[PDB]
Amino acid sequence: DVGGLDMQKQEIREAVELPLVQPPRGVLLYGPPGTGKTMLVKAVANSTKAAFIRVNGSEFVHKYLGEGPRMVRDV
């Protein structure tokens, strides 16, 4: 749905979709997101059909020394 990303969508598949089935514990999408790069996420997140969890690096800014990582752990 962003045309021509096959190699890269394969690259993600190679990064994730395959290693989910078959090892990297994390994969780095590099570039402007929301550009189709975020579409990369959902598109594959759709295709992968593993329970999807997005985060923002902006989700945890809460001023507390405190809760924080808990669900970051528990989620």
Binding site: D1, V2, G3, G4, L5, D6
Partner: peptide, 13 residues
């Protein structure tokens, strides 16, 4: 963007 991509991008929207 290689043109096949655009070609696919264009052939997308």
């Amino acid at each position: 963007r290689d043109r096949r991509e655009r070609r696919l991008i264009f052939g997308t929207i």
